[PDB]
Amino acid sequence: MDVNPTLLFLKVPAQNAISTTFPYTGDPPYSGTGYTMDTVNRTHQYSEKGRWTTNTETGAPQLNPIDGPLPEDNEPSGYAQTDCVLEAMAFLEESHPGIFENSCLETMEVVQQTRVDKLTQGRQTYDWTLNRNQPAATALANTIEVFRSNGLTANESGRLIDFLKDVMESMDKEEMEITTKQRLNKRSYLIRALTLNTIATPGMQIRGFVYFVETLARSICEKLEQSGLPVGGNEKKAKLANVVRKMMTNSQDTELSFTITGDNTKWNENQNPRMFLAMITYITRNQPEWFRNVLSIAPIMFSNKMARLGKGYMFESKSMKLRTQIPAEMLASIDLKYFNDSTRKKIEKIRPLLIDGTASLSPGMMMGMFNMLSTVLGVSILNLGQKRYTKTTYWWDGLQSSDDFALIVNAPNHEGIQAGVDRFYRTCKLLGINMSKKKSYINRTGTFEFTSFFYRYGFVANFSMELPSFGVSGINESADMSIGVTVIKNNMINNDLGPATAQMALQLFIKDYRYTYRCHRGDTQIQTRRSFEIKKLWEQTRSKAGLLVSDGGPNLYNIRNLHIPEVCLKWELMDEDYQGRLCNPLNPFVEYDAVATTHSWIPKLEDEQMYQKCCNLFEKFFPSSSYRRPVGISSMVEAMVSRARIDARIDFESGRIKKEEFAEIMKICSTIEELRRQ
């Protein structure tokens, strides 16, 4: 025959075999400026009927579709009505009284008591000091350095709010200089501070404000049942069943219940930052003005945001056989003869918005950033489905995330179901929410999908998580075993990893571990460089079951004991002398549980590591700093000098140090104090 794996769905329901419709297990081995231009053009086209203004601070053209013409077709529209958004927010507050006030009270603490180092946690971030993407910590250090070079010294208190005050103060001065000695005027600095690099990253000036906004949004979402974003694992599978139970508990069953397996692909491009500003303004009513101000800055800078085009285009010449790179910065004056038909149309339609090498993108939002706030906006529409709001025989409820949504509509008859679906769709349009009527479908309640969670008559399958790596981690062979078994155990608990699949992942990990560390079992014929030592250890050992895998021992790991460190697991089966050798504190070589053994060995801005040198020097004077956060009102120099003086004094009297060395230490301490007064 001809094998057709798709025919398996003729016997097995789609949901039970849906796992076979996911091609990859991990990031595929494949991956531009043209896409960025397409995104900008689409974003401005969906909202082209709004007002046009030129920024007085940047000179960038800006498009404002808020309160624009109402749509008259089923195309994406950014014309979100301010009054409609505010009414939805008011009704959300009404259905959950005290939600916004309580969220603001909870968030003020985070705003007041957050440290600047909170801003080092994240993926690559755009670095305005270098016009390049950098790690969060490096970008933060660079920003702090450049701010210090200028008269901006307020983040030297360990508060994110003080660093954000520095950010606000930076935009006031008329000159910003970067030493590596570049000079930036006010307009160029503003343009680089509002730049979103490239699936997009903001600079190290919008990240703190975004963080506070997202904290407030998480606080709000934690109190909403329809919010499916913040939770994840087997408690989202609870939400999927809970909504169906809510919508299916009918008395004298006559109503019809239909479920929309919704899709909202590319719905961020119709999310205007101005509506998010209105959202935050309504959420923070009757709150301190400082809190309103700090929460009302990220949308302010997103309304003025600007997309960096990226690398650019590359050209080819078949005659002279040469290549050139054309940076997007100079792609505003190039003659359009070189470009392709599609590309020259893009470059022509985006030229008006190009300024200082970046496109001006006021309308819309990019993936990420305001995920929680968009979830709040969606739950606002889901909140309007209550009969008290839909004053009709039909009502709806559902789940909301930043990527997908689910809707359940209940009505006495099919016409009522159509009326409910139409009303939900039209209310979504009034708030700039564009349902994708290309990837959405409706069926009677009993089966639906939500963020790769497939529900079928009470059974939910979680296929939203990529099967993780089950190879070595690249650390000592003692830590790799612990990490490998812990990853499997954690996937069994959180990502619905099957027992048999977990056992075979254990087998593959043990194979990879043995081939990386050449620790094949002592009774095998495999001949590595390490085979002789391992075989000698195998022969000399009476109990060939307490030997670790690192020592050519057996693998005793199974499902029941994935939570137990290997050394403890094999402790009772160990030879006493092998214990004494392996677990010898005086050996030459040295979120997981591992016992320190001989296998815990170690293998092979003018000063980037300046910050990671004073801390390491402090840890030598105060070893407890590696376990607990240091506390003290004195300086680093005073602490270390006093420690050295006391230690040298006690050490000289103990005889471990001669008098001359003690005098030398005291002299160096005096010199260090002298340097302390410069």
């Binding site: 600047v116 080092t120 910590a137 933060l140 250090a141 030297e156 609870a238 069943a241 399958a461 981690s473 954690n490 608990i493 099957g498 977990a502 002789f532 030592e533 000399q540 029941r560 939570h563 137990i564 403890c568 402790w571 009772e572 002398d577 092998y578 050798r581 392996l582 677990c583 010898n584 504190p585 050996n587 030459p588 070589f589 320190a596 001989t598 296998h599 060995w601 170690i602 293998p603 092979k604 590591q609 300046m610 990671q612 040198k613 801390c615 020097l617 407890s624 700093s625 376990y627 607990r628 506390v631 009102i633 004195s634 005073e638 602490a639 006093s642 050295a644 003086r645 260090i672 340097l675």
Partner: protein
């Protein structure tokens, strides 16, 4: 000698001196987070490449004296220190043997897990569509008689007695747990930091939201990969001093002290000691008897 020389070197520079002289000890957790990145160039491939070559591991200079240069078979074990993993296997095979008696006490929680699993009982496995409920379940069961802060103080007075703060040093009465932990770990050589981390695991309670369809006794939560899955439930039963701060350092009362010599100075004598991870303070022994009681009654007299 080396540490102070490195400190002098750092403060010779214009930038590092600024950090050292301006950053207080409080704001180090912040500074420690200013690091670089982009180092994981597929570290598994790096480890394979490193294990492919000889002498991948780093050992102390004593390696040359404890372990012979060449194997019984003629295989080189170390070189100028850069060491082969065959040296690790050699040490595990015929290296020095010591008494591993502290390990059951330091790693008591891991051995508790081992004992619980060893004597546990398995019932049948039931296939249903059970519902798991999100609950605050404690992953690590801390000591019942110790609060979160009291547990940290015990870990601090037993592992780093020389860096205890004014809260520990100025509070009369010592917990019995600290007294027994000090004698249990009197001669322990494992490591101060590993000991501190295991003590934290043993003494401090940790809690998380897990969706669980059964017990939450901290013994049913460790075995959760084993007891519950997508569509099945596995029946399982687990086996079983006082001082007073007077002000900043005073040079009239001699040099500074560490927190071990305060044990014998005098009753009511003034001395200055380096407490915690920083500032030196002038302290005495509390001459009078001060205790905490129902001070509300005393204050109501006004």
């Amino acid at each position: 000698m080396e540490r102070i020389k490195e400190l002098r070197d750092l403060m010779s520079q214009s930038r590092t001196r600024e950090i050292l002289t301006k950053t207080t000890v409080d704001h180090m957790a912040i500074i420690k987070k200013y690091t670089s990145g982009r180092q994981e160039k597929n570290p598994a491939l790096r480890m394979k490449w490193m294990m492919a070559m000889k002498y991948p591991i780093t050992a102390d200079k004593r390696i040359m004296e404890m372990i012979p240069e060449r194997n019984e078979q003629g295989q080189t074990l170390w070189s100028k220190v850069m060491v082969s993993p065959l040296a690790v296997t050699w040490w595990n095979r015929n290296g020095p043997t010591t008494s591993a008696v502290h390990y059951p006490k330091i790693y008591k929680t891991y051995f508790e897990k081992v004992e619980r699993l060893k004597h546990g009982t398995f019932g049948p496995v039931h296939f249903r569509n059970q519902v798991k409920i999100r609950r605050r379940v404690d992953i690590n069961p801390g000591h019942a008689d110790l609060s979160a802060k009291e547990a940290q103080d015990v870990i601090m007075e037993v592992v780093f007695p020389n860096e205890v703060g004014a809260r520990i040093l100025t509070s009369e009465s010592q917990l019995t747990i600290t007294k027994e932990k000090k004698e249990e770990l009197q001669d322990c050589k494992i490591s101060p930091l590993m000991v501190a981390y295991m003590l934290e695991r043993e003494l401090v309670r940790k809690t998380r939201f897990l969706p669980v369809a059964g017990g939450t006794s901290s013994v049913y939560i460790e075995v959760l990969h084993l007891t519950q899955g997508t569509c099945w439930e596995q029946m399982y039963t687990p086996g079983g001093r006082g001082f007073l701060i007077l002000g900043k350092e005073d040079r009239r009362y001699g040099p500074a002290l560490s927190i071990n010599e305060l044990s014998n100075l005098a009753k009511g004598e003034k001395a200055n000691v380096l407490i915690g991870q920083g500032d030196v303070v002038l302290v005495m022994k509390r001459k009078r008897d001060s205790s905490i009681l129902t001070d509300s009654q005393t204050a109501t007299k006004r």
